């Protein structure tokens, strides 16, 4: 009945309407600020925009995200993943 | 499998939250460079002409 695109569109509408979008987004940016993640990523992004800013973008972000994904503390990653899964468990049927 | 669907969605959702964080920081830092390039260029050229 419901295809993957419909399901994911529905999951996101509910994520935002339930308010969980902001709760998770806020929790995350707070955890990431606590561990100085933003500043490292700022330097990384700023360092990677260099040596040569080639101003049509964004091929570079694909390279920055991987280390940035790894650069997230296990505490933050696990905590946020737990919140997300908790939201989904409440919303998915059967 | 409901759990397989939930785990995958959890992973994709986490990637999205994080990609957004990066997106905003990328936008933020980018504004800083242009502003910085504008100032340095202005006052360098002013200097080179003094």
């Amino acid at each position: 009945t419901m295809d993957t695109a419909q399901l994911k569109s529905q999951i996101q509408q509910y994520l935002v309407e339930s308010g969980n979008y902001e709760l998770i987004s806020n929790e995350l940016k707070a955890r990431l600020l606590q561990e100085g993640w933003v500043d490292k990523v700022k330097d990384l992004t700023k360092s990677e925009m260099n040596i040569n800013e080639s101003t049509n973008f964004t091929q570079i972000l694909s390279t920055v995200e991987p280390k940035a994904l790894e650069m997230v503390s296990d505490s933050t990653r696990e905590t946020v993943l737990k919140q997300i899964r908790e939201f989904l468990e409440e919303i998915v049927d059967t | 499998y409901r759990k397989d669907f939930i785990d995958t969605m959890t992973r994709e959702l986490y990637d999205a939250f994080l990609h957004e964080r990066l997106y905003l920081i990328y936008m933020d830092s980018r504004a800083e460079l242009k502003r910085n390039s504008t100032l340095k260029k202005k006052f360098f050229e002013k200097w080179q002409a003094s």
Binding site: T1, M2, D3, L7, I11, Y14, V92, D93, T94 | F5
Partner: peptide
Amino acid sequence: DKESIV
């Protein structure tokens, strides 16, 4: 497939 949300 057949998954249902809310």
